[PDB]
């Protein structure tokens, strides 16, 4: 029971599966699409201190990954290099074939130390971390991501109507993921 949205005449209605209204025509798997949309586009605060308050560490929950075929240009991506004060890794290395988000104007690269009190870092509002055509529930080390969400669509029969430089800003942080966290941008 996941909302499947069917495009009508220049409109999007989520087709209700309990009833069966046949005027929708799906003649091929090419009409099926998954799309990633950025939370940025809804007006959420993008400042680093604001963004990092949405993430938190937790033990006991296995991570999960789901693919998507098409995405949105992001203005802001993030890239984390966080270690414990003795010097240890609190973010797991990217598995084979998880690469960074393809298109973002700004990559905010944050380095520093924190308590990292948990095995994996999750999104407190339940959104996803978007990578190159793979959305994950957790943050990987040293890999640029965007915050976003996934939708599934039945596209219309006509193909045609539907479907580069980057900069890095560096920050140092102490007490990352705490009530008061110290950042200095270089």
């Amino acid at each position: 029971s996941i909302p499947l949205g069917v495009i009508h005449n220049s409109a999007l209605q989520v087709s209700d599966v309990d009833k069966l209204v046949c005027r929708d025509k799906l003649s091929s798997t090419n009409q099926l699409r998954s799309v990633g949309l950025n939370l940025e586009g809804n007006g959420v605060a993008t400042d680093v201190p604001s963004a990092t308050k949405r993430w938190g560490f937790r033990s006991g929950v296995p991570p999960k990954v789901v693919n998507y075929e098409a995405g949105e240009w992001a203005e802001n991506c993030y890239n984390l290099e966080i270690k414990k004060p003795d010097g240890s890794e609190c973010l797991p290395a990217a598995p084979d074939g998880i690469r960074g988000f393809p298109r973002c104007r700004y990559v905010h690269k944050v380095s520093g130390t924190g308590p990292c009190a948990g095995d994996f870092a999750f999104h407190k509002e339940g959104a996803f971390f978007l990578y190159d055509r793979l959305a994950s529930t957790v943050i990987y080390r040293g890999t640029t991501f965007a915050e976003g969400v996934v939708a599934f669509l039945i596209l219309p029969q006509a193909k045609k109507d539907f479907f580069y430089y980057s900069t890095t800003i560096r920050y140092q942080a102490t007490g990352f993921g705490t009530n008061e966290t110290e950042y200095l941008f270089e």
Epitope: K83, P85, D86, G87, S111, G114, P115, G175, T178, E182
Partner: antibody, heavy 122, light 110 residues
Amino acid sequence: VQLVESGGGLVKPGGSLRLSCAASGFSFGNAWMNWVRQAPGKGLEWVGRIKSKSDGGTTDYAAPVKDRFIISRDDSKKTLYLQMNSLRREDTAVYYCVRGPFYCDTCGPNDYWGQGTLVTVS
Amino acid sequence: SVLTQPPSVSGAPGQRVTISCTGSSSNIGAGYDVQWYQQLPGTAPKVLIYGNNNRPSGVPDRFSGSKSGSSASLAITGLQAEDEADYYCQTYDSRLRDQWVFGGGTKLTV
């Protein structure tokens, strides 16, 4: 694994001394190094830390000792150095170098601290 | 925000004792590990407990510990003559720019 710290000697108040901690037996280049001290009769104190080259290479210092001590390292000689200058009284203590991350599969005890070098100011 | 510790603890041979280390909401309850060191008179500290629960190879299982709220405990059961030492608890302060903080130390006697 060995940490050998040397260069502690009697010093007149206001003078300068240099301490070295030569490491062997482990991946020196991938560890964070700390200097701590213990004054006679009292407990342990932390003076400073230096990070690995791969993580910035920056140094932090405790508030009493900041601006008078400088910590550095040389990965070509595997040596940690603490330069003490403007050595005003109240710095008398045994100094120790502490090595890296505590998370070791097989390192075991007696592999994280040295033996201790006595520095007296008089 | 500096960790506290009792001046000294005592106990009969063969029994269990616990050493308390009490911190603050920025030190232990913020999610940082607590380490325990044993300094025998005349020598240098050796690592006894690291990462709140872990023991390095070679340390007897008589030594353990735990963390709760803003405090931590070290439990040693079966006191032997060789256990006389000064014990220190350590953690990372989060309001002091992630700098080491040490406990006052507790002397053990048998």
